[PDB]
């Protein structure tokens, strides 16, 4: 009260909670992007120099 | 990247040409100008029978 206002305690309750979020957020996003289908070159027509028709 | 959808083919394939040498080649049966079929799993035992010349 003598330094932070009212809103001082919910907004660092939501700052842990995003912080959280956030680390989990980007142990999501590093996963996801390692498995992805353009990091793997998964479900892509890799182009041919004669473009061969199976 | 989803799997990708090809378009299926809408003419002539080679299954038709397959299914009916496949057919041709089995059952017996009665050529236009010759006597009679010997079906495949038989004419190569008629082969392996009566011998191939040798040198």
Partial sequence: ?54 | PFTPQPAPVTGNTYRTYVNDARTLLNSYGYTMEGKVHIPIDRAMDLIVERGLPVR
């Fill in chain 1, 1 to 54: 009260a003598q330094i932070f206002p009212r809103n001082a305690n919910l907004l660092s309750r939501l700052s842990i909670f995003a912080l959280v979020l956030l680390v989990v957020e980007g142990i999501l996003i590093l996963g996801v992007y390692f498995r992805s289908n353009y990091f793997r070159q998964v479900n892509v027509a890799i182009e041919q120099p004669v473009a061969f028709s199976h």
